[PDB]
Amino acid sequence: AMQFDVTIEIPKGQRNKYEVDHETGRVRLDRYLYTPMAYPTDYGFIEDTLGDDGDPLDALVLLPQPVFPGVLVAARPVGMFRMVDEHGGDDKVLCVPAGDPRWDHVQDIGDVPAFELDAIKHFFVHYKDLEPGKFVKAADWVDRAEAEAEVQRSVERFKA
Amino acid sequence: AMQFDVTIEIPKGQRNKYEVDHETGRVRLDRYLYTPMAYPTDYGFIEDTLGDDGDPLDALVLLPQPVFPGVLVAARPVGMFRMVDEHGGDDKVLCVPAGDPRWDHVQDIGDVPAFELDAIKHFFVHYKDLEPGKFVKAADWVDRAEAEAEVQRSVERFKA
Amino acid sequence: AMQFDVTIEIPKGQRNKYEVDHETGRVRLDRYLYTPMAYPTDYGFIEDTLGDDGDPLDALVLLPQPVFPGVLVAARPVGMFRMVDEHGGDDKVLCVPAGDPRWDHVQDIGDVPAFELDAIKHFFVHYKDLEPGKFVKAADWVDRAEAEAEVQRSVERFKA
Amino acid sequence: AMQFDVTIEIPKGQRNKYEVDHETGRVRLDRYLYTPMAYPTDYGFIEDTLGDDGDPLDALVLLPQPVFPGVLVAARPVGMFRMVDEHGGDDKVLCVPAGDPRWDHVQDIGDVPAFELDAIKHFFVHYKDLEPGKFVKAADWVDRAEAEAEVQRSVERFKA
Amino acid sequence: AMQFDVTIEIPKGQRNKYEVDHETGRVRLDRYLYTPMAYPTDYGFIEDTLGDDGDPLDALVLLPQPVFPGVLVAARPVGMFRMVDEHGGDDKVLCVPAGDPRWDHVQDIGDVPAFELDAIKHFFVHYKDLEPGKFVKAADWVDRAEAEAEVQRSVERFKA
Amino acid sequence: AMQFDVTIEIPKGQRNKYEVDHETGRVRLDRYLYTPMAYPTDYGFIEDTLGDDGDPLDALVLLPQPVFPGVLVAARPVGMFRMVDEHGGDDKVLCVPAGDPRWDHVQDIGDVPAFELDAIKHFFVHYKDLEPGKFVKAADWVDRAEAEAEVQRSVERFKA
Ligand SMILES: [Ca+2]
Ligand SMILES: [Ca+2]
Ligand SMILES: [Ca+2]
Ligand SMILES: [Ca+2]
Ligand SMILES: [Ca+2]
Ligand SMILES: [Ca+2]
Ligand SMILES: [Ca+2]
Ligand SMILES: [Ca+2]
Ligand SMILES: [Ca+2]
Ligand SMILES: [Ca+2]
Ligand SMILES: [Ca+2]
Ligand SMILES: [Ca+2]
Ligand SMILES: [Ca+2]
Ligand SMILES: [Ca+2]
Ligand SMILES: [Ca+2]
Ligand SMILES: [Ca+2]
Ligand SMILES: [Ca+2]
Ligand SMILES: [Ca+2]
């Protein structure tokens, strides 16, 4: 079963948008969001990836309790939120903690309630509403198969 | 200068939507929001009011630090967020703490930055997005004069 | 479908054990727990009940986010944690928010994962470990039918 | 052994100064402090007292973990912080939770480390530094005997 | 007087169990605990040690306020919680902040109240209760002399 | 316009005083403050500086919401709190987030309310009150021009 390490940048509940300077590994404040929204899940990026936009591949991790920024979490993917913004493709792999039997009932995109999925989508559809020149479109939930393929691809680009 | 007591129901930052049962004064959980949004300001209602929809008149209070639900805050109005939802008129009086010289620079709607005002509006425009049969429209910022008039009116209805 | 109001005394995560003086409705600190444990769910009591031990019937409410002490939550039962302590029967009705379609998949005790149920049980089996003269035994999960019956019974005693 | 109920208005750590309207029992925001200071202990007032300034007698309660505003705590006194401000005498009874054997080693003012006592004093000496027309003087730690006497006195005035 | 640096992995109050990948120094989520328990003290490991189980020697640090994961704290030992789990010896050195006169009254294991010591023990006796194949036994508090000896030993193994 | 990276060591609200070991970049607990005070702003140091006391130049960053320790924030200076302590000059550059139009109204020291400036000063005047052999004097607010000059100077010393 595929699994990888996600470095969580942003705990669920946060309106501060944290980033990593990937050359140093330092945590940075990108910005305080302009909309009254909060990250709907712990959010970060998969280590050792280069995604379809030449940046590390982003990840959403479902957790019973948020972690802190900078924290590593072994995760396995269950689907992906495909999406395009002002800078191109900017997909978000949906994950759950790997090796944790409490999440064994969550295997594919159909195992996550439509309420959570809609909430996550709503966040990404709207979080940049009040930033001029930023938008998101082509918002679309896809399944684990497509998540794994995109992870695989992005692991190769990182090595190549 | 007009001033009144706001009972804060919801601290800034909250996705739990709290209410008061007005016959008992008890704090109640209305619902956890369906959108990944958080109240942009401390939010409650003005004591001893009956607003244009037969419910107590709602208030937003700007604070350097949030309070807890149930807490009273002496406030003075500086503008109002006019708005209509599925149940009619549902305006929100914008306030600052009364008698606090740190807020003396905030007198009318023009004294609050467009960033905060847009954020507040965005919240109310979108918080009910994923609740079917609920919407908001006629979103409009108005000045202190109109806030005071609507407060006055609603104080009378409460007595009448 | 049965539903009732729970007054939450203790948010999930708390080692402070809060109580209500039922004659006044005031929130009181019973004690800081002696064990390094935290309430596994929001915890309180059902309003207008007299349980099998002459005290109000206790409730556990599953929530996506904790509330504050004193808060009312409309809830419906899905099972019960039967249990006896030094002062007799001291059952805990397991609930979810009433009228919230996000919890519609949770109808009976079999709909709650064994992990959560074991965790809840573990808490009540051990929280009083270091208090001399206090114990719990006859720990047993039962279904909604038995929860409703015990609620019904306790509503009658409150009126009688 | 003397004991009484303290209604905690302010958790340790807070820069929001909460009050009670004693005619209604409602919690109110008095003000956000003007100095960058935080209450050094849970702070409130003893129920059913009228202190030497015609206001309820104030209490500091040592706790392993703070409570929320409005919460009642059975407490016993161990000393008092005598003090005078712009409105006269404004003493603060130092307490620990009554009936809790974890605090049995704390019986009189000499049982509380000089570090905590100095910190508490420092708070009250300085919290009003930037409020014009407010000051505190005659800051003085006294023992349990004097605390009990002042409590007793203030219980009588409340009845008389 | 012996002193050393502890890297705190887990603040007091946490049910998320954090770890360090010792080759990278990165903070990692080991798991969310399966029991409704919370770390009773700030918890981590002593830098530059190899303990009796070939892993870094673990430390509990008493603090007036928790730190964040990853934080270094100069500490001095006052006793040790000896203990064996499924993977062998897994002792926990009890410490207080070095060079802080507020902790000068705490010199040896007898200076820490039996309540805290019992609570700490209870945590480690039970935290793994619901993890199959994990247990702890030979739980035993020992004094500073034995703590220092075990630290010394583990400093040597790290160099050897 | 001048801008630089501040590594925030201490979030606003904290009584734990965090430090960086500048040779390793590790976050360390310096001490829990002895006074009941809390940092009035996010506090840290400007990367790649050597200030007038041979230590990195310290920075205060105004934020709508605090960050975590270790976090980098692109900032631009708007003034400086000049100050001398037991170890010499120990100035604090006042900053706001660089590239954030919400702070464009804050350009020089006159753009920050006297209330915030007095609060910040009060903190540094008093935070060491109960530490023997530590003091601060020559407390003085100066403008952006002088802040930039001192930053420039300290960037050179770091290279030289
Ligand atoms: Ca990113
Ligand atoms: Ca960016
Ligand atoms: Ca936009
Ligand atoms: Ca309302
Ligand atoms: Ca409603
Ligand atoms: Ca809708
Ligand atoms: Ca109870
Ligand atoms: Ca009790
Ligand atoms: Ca027991
Ligand atoms: Ca008072
Ligand atoms: Ca007052
Ligand atoms: Ca003054
Ligand atoms: Ca470890
Ligand atoms: Ca492990
Ligand atoms: Ca086990
Ligand atoms: Ca420093
Ligand atoms: Ca230092
Ligand atoms: Ca000093």
Side-chain angles (χ1 to χ4, degrees):
Chain A
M2 171 172 289
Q3 89 170 51
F4 40 71
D5 278 359
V6 180
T7 291
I8 296 302
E9 310 179 284
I10 316 177
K12 173 187 173 175
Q14 274 282 19
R15 184 168 166 182
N16 270 346
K17 176 171 187 303
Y18 297 107
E19 250 174 344
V20 169
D21 296 334
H22 298 285
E23 294 183 6
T24 70
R26 295 293 305 278
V27 180
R28 171 181 292 283
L29 179 66
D30 178 349
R31 65 205 181 255
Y32 181 65
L33 298 185
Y34 288 84
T35 56
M37 307 191 73
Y39 275 81
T41 74
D42 279 46
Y43 173 100
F45 64 92
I46 307 180
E47 289 281 337
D48 311 326
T49 56
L50 205 60
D52 292 343
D53 69 334
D55 290 0
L57 185 57
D58 290 326
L60 310 174
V61 190
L62 300 175
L63 295 177
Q65 190 187 303
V67 299
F68 296 78
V71 172
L72 281 169
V73 179
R76 64 179 170 76
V78 298
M80 180 167 53
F81 184 70
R82 261 199 233 288
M83 143 201 166
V84 168
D85 67 4
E86 75 278 357
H87 301 327
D90 190 24
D91 300 340
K92 276 94 167 85
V93 182
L94 183 56
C95 313
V96 297
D100 185 331
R102 291 168 291 190
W103 296 91
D104 280 356
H105 72 286
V106 183
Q107 292 299 328
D108 218 322
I109 198 58
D111 302 320
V112 185
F115 292 111
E116 293 181 30
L117 295 182
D118 289 340
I120 289 156
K121 175 177 169 163
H122 187 278
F123 175 83
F124 287 105
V125 170
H126 295 282
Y127 75 128
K128 297 191 279 214
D129 277 355
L130 305 172
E131 312 199 54
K134 313 189 186 190
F135 58 87
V136 333
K137 64 210 190 86
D140 182 38
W141 284 110
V142 306
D143 67 10
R144 176 172 58 183
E146 297 188 55
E148 302 207 3
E150 182 160 341
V151 170
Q152 207 65 77
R153 182 196 320 157
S154 306
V155 169
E156 294 161 16
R157 271 194 295 259
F158 182 79
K159 292 166 173 168
Chain B
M2 171 172 289
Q3 89 170 51
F4 40 71
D5 278 359
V6 180
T7 291
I8 296 302
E9 310 179 284
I10 316 177
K12 173 187 173 175
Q14 274 282 19
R15 184 168 166 182
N16 270 346
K17 176 171 187 303
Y18 297 107
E19 250 174 344
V20 169
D21 296 334
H22 298 285
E23 294 183 6
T24 70
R26 295 293 305 278
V27 180
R28 171 181 292 283
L29 179 66
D30 178 349
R31 65 205 181 255
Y32 181 65
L33 298 185
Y34 288 84
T35 56
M37 307 191 73
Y39 275 81
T41 74
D42 279 46
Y43 173 100
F45 64 92
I46 307 180
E47 289 281 337
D48 311 326
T49 56
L50 205 60
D52 292 343
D53 69 334
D55 290 0
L57 185 57
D58 290 326
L60 310 174
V61 190
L62 300 175
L63 295 177
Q65 190 187 303
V67 299
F68 296 78
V71 172
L72 281 169
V73 179
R76 64 179 170 76
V78 298
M80 180 167 53
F81 184 70
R82 261 199 233 288
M83 143 201 166
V84 168
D85 67 4
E86 75 278 357
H87 301 327
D90 190 24
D91 300 340
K92 276 94 167 85
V93 182
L94 183 56
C95 313
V96 297
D100 185 331
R102 291 168 291 190
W103 296 91
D104 280 356
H105 72 286
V106 183
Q107 292 299 328
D108 218 322
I109 198 58
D111 302 320
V112 185
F115 292 111
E116 293 181 30
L117 295 182
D118 289 340
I120 289 156
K121 175 177 169 163
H122 187 278
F123 175 83
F124 287 105
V125 170
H126 295 282
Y127 75 128
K128 297 191 279 214
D129 277 355
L130 305 172
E131 312 199 54
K134 313 189 186 190
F135 58 87
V136 333
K137 64 210 190 86
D140 182 38
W141 284 110
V142 306
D143 67 10
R144 176 172 58 183
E146 297 188 55
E148 302 207 3
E150 182 160 341
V151 170
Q152 207 65 77
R153 182 196 320 157
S154 306
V155 169
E156 294 161 16
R157 271 194 295 259
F158 182 79
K159 292 166 173 168
Chain C
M2 171 172 289
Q3 89 170 51
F4 40 71
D5 278 359
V6 180
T7 291
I8 296 302
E9 310 179 284
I10 316 177
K12 173 187 173 175
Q14 274 282 19
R15 184 168 166 182
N16 270 346
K17 176 171 187 303
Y18 297 107
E19 250 174 344
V20 169
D21 296 334
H22 298 285
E23 294 183 6
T24 70
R26 295 293 305 278
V27 180
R28 171 181 292 283
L29 179 66
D30 178 349
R31 65 205 181 255
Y32 181 65
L33 298 185
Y34 288 84
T35 56
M37 307 191 73
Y39 275 81
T41 74
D42 279 46
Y43 173 100
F45 64 92
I46 307 180
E47 289 281 337
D48 311 326
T49 56
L50 205 60
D52 292 343
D53 69 334
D55 290 0
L57 185 57
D58 290 326
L60 310 174
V61 190
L62 300 175
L63 295 177
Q65 190 187 303
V67 299
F68 296 78
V71 172
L72 281 169
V73 179
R76 64 179 170 76
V78 298
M80 180 167 53
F81 184 70
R82 261 199 233 288
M83 143 201 166
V84 168
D85 67 4
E86 75 278 357
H87 301 327
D90 190 24
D91 300 340
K92 276 94 167 85
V93 182
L94 183 56
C95 313
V96 297
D100 185 331
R102 291 168 291 190
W103 296 91
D104 280 356
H105 72 286
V106 183
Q107 292 299 328
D108 218 322
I109 198 58
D111 302 320
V112 185
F115 292 111
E116 293 181 30
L117 295 182
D118 289 340
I120 289 156
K121 175 177 169 163
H122 187 278
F123 175 83
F124 287 105
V125 170
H126 295 282
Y127 75 128
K128 297 191 279 214
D129 277 355
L130 305 172
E131 312 199 54
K134 313 189 186 190
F135 58 87
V136 333
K137 64 210 190 86
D140 182 38
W141 284 110
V142 306
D143 67 10
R144 176 172 58 183
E146 297 188 55
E148 302 207 3
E150 182 160 341
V151 170
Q152 207 65 77
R153 182 196 320 157
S154 306
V155 169
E156 294 161 16
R157 271 194 295 259
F158 182 79
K159 292 166 173 168
Chain D
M2 171 172 289
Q3 89 170 51
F4 40 71
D5 278 359
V6 180
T7 291
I8 296 302
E9 310 179 284
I10 316 177
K12 173 187 173 175
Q14 274 282 19
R15 184 168 166 182
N16 270 346
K17 176 171 187 303
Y18 297 107
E19 250 174 344
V20 169
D21 296 334
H22 298 285
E23 294 183 6
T24 70
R26 295 293 305 278
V27 180
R28 171 181 292 283
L29 179 66
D30 178 349
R31 65 205 181 255
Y32 181 65
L33 298 185
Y34 288 84
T35 56
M37 307 191 73
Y39 275 81
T41 74
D42 279 46
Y43 173 100
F45 64 92
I46 307 180
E47 289 281 337
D48 311 326
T49 56
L50 205 60
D52 292 343
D53 69 334
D55 290 0
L57 185 57
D58 290 326
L60 310 174
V61 190
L62 300 175
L63 295 177
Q65 190 187 303
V67 299
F68 296 78
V71 172
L72 281 169
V73 179
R76 64 179 170 76
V78 298
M80 180 167 53
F81 184 70
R82 261 199 233 288
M83 143 201 166
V84 168
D85 67 4
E86 75 278 357
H87 301 327
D90 190 24
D91 300 340
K92 276 94 167 85
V93 182
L94 183 56
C95 313
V96 297
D100 185 331
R102 291 168 291 190
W103 296 91
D104 280 356
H105 72 286
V106 183
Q107 292 299 328
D108 218 322
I109 198 58
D111 302 320
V112 185
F115 292 111
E116 293 181 30
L117 295 182
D118 289 340
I120 289 156
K121 175 177 169 163
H122 187 278
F123 175 83
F124 287 105
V125 170
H126 295 282
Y127 75 128
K128 297 191 279 214
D129 277 355
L130 305 172
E131 312 199 54
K134 313 189 186 190
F135 58 87
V136 333
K137 64 210 190 86
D140 182 38
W141 284 110
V142 306
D143 67 10
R144 176 172 58 183
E146 297 188 55
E148 302 207 3
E150 182 160 341
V151 170
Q152 207 65 77
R153 182 196 320 157
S154 306
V155 169
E156 294 161 16
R157 271 194 295 259
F158 182 79
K159 292 166 173 168
Chain E
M2 171 172 289
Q3 89 170 51
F4 40 71
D5 278 359
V6 180
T7 291
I8 296 302
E9 310 179 284
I10 316 177
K12 173 187 173 175
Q14 274 282 19
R15 184 168 166 182
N16 270 346
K17 176 171 187 303
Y18 297 107
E19 250 174 344
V20 169
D21 296 334
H22 298 285
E23 294 183 6
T24 70
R26 295 293 305 278
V27 180
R28 171 181 292 283
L29 179 66
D30 178 349
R31 65 205 181 255
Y32 181 65
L33 298 185
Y34 288 84
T35 56
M37 307 191 73
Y39 275 81
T41 74
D42 279 46
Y43 173 100
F45 64 92
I46 307 180
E47 289 281 337
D48 311 326
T49 56
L50 205 60
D52 292 343
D53 69 334
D55 290 0
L57 185 57
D58 290 326
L60 310 174
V61 190
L62 300 175
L63 295 177
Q65 190 187 303
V67 299
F68 296 78
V71 172
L72 281 169
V73 179
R76 64 179 170 76
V78 298
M80 180 167 53
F81 184 70
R82 261 199 233 288
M83 143 201 166
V84 168
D85 67 4
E86 75 278 357
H87 301 327
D90 190 24
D91 300 340
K92 276 94 167 85
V93 182
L94 183 56
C95 313
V96 297
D100 185 331
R102 291 168 291 190
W103 296 91
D104 280 356
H105 72 286
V106 183
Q107 292 299 328
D108 218 322
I109 198 58
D111 302 320
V112 185
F115 292 111
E116 293 181 30
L117 295 182
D118 289 340
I120 289 156
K121 175 177 169 163
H122 187 278
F123 175 83
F124 287 105
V125 170
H126 295 282
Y127 75 128
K128 297 191 279 214
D129 277 355
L130 305 172
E131 312 199 54
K134 313 189 186 190
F135 58 87
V136 333
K137 64 210 190 86
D140 182 38
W141 284 110
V142 306
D143 67 10
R144 176 172 58 183
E146 297 188 55
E148 302 207 3
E150 182 160 341
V151 170
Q152 207 65 77
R153 182 196 320 157
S154 306
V155 169
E156 294 161 16
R157 271 194 295 259
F158 182 79
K159 292 166 173 168
Chain F
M2 171 172 289
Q3 89 170 51
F4 40 71
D5 278 359
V6 180
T7 291
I8 296 302
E9 310 179 284
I10 316 177
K12 173 187 173 175
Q14 274 282 19
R15 184 168 166 182
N16 270 346
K17 176 171 187 303
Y18 297 107
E19 250 174 344
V20 169
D21 296 334
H22 298 285
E23 294 183 6
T24 70
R26 295 293 305 278
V27 180
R28 171 181 292 283
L29 179 66
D30 178 349
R31 65 205 181 255
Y32 181 65
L33 298 185
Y34 288 84
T35 56
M37 307 191 73
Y39 275 81
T41 74
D42 279 46
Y43 173 100
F45 64 92
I46 307 180
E47 289 281 337
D48 311 326
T49 56
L50 205 60
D52 292 343
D53 69 334
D55 290 0
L57 185 57
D58 290 326
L60 310 174
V61 190
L62 300 175
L63 295 177
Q65 190 187 303
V67 299
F68 296 78
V71 172
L72 281 169
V73 179
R76 64 179 170 76
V78 298
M80 180 167 53
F81 184 70
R82 261 199 233 288
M83 143 201 166
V84 168
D85 67 4
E86 75 278 357
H87 301 327
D90 190 24
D91 300 340
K92 276 94 167 85
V93 182
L94 183 56
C95 313
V96 297
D100 185 331
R102 291 168 291 190
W103 296 91
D104 280 356
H105 72 286
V106 183
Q107 292 299 328
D108 218 322
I109 198 58
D111 302 320
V112 185
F115 292 111
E116 293 181 30
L117 295 182
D118 289 340
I120 289 156
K121 175 177 169 163
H122 187 278
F123 175 83
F124 287 105
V125 170
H126 295 282
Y127 75 128
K128 297 191 279 214
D129 277 355
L130 305 172
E131 312 199 54
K134 313 189 186 190
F135 58 87
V136 333
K137 64 210 190 86
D140 182 38
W141 284 110
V142 306
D143 67 10
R144 176 172 58 183
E146 297 188 55
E148 302 207 3
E150 182 160 341
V151 170
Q152 207 65 77
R153 182 196 320 157
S154 306
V155 169
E156 294 161 16
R157 271 194 295 259
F158 182 79
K159 292 166 173 168

